């Protein structure tokens, strides 16, 4: 059989993984609730590189209109979860 | 009235499955519906299809193809046993034909 059903917890661990592999983000001060522009001091192009990293992570593409608003890791977790039909 | 006429409203169609969850789609009465199903299936699939196909399959050779094959076999045997041509380009005897005498 194929891959086991995704669990929100594995999702969120993975998003945090890619986020601390990003050079412009402080690992010891990044949280699941950290705003990208406001708390971490990034601009729109950093946020675009971040969504592209997330699609490279989870192997599925995110539409531009929807992404414009994924401004914290929790929002990315919620988007991926509601897209791939994970409740827990 | 700003209306044109006194008319009944167009009713919604009723689902035969609502009052009869196994309703066969023949009739509202479940008994009549079941028996309509049974007569259709018996007289169409059992009587006409099977017995009719069998009857047509075993129809006697009134088209005379076996007879024609045996006749051709007799003719071929006799004709190349005697050295005669298998077939003649004339279907009818030229001695029984009386052509118009002069052609110019």
């Amino acid at each position: 059989s194929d891959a086991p059903p995704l669990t929100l917890e594995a999702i969120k661990d993975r998003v945090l993984y890619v986020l601390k592999l990003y050079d412009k983000i402080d690992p010891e001060k990044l949280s699941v609730n950290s705003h990208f522009m406001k708390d971490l001091g990034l601009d729109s192009l950093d946020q675009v590189e971040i969504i592209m990293a997330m699609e490279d992570e989870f192997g599925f593409e995110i539409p531009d209109i929807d992404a414009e608003k994924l401004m914290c890791p929790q929002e990315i977790v919620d988007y991926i979860a509601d897209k791939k039909d994970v409740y827990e | 009235p700003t209306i044109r006429l006194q008319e009944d409203p167009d009713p919604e169609d009723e689902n035969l499955y609502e009052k009869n969850p196994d309703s066969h789609g023949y009739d509202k009465d479940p008994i009549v519906d079941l028996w309509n199903m049974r007569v259709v299936f018996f007289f169409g699939f059992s009587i006409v299809l099977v017995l009719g196909s069998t009857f047509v399959a075993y129809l006697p050779d009134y088209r005379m193809q076996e007879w024609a094959r045996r006749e051709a076999e007799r003719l071929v045997k006799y004709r190349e046993a005697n050295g005669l041509p298998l077939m003649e380009s004339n279907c009818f005897d030229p001695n029984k034909i009386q052509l118009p005498e002069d052609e110019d």
Binding site: P5 | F42, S46, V50, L51, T54, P60
Partner: protein, 69 residues
Amino acid sequence: KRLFIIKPSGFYDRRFLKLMRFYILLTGIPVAIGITLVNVFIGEAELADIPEGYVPEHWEYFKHPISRW
């Protein structure tokens, strides 16, 4: 974990197929057995010459027993 599979109802197509098979077989199994019994025990006729002065019936010009009947 086992989830529920939303499908349309398969009861009615399955019931139709069972009924059709049932009626077709109900009358077509006896016919198959009868044709086998005839072919085995009765059999076809053999070609023979028309005996002297004899005139056959119209059905005596065919070889299969079912076609003859």
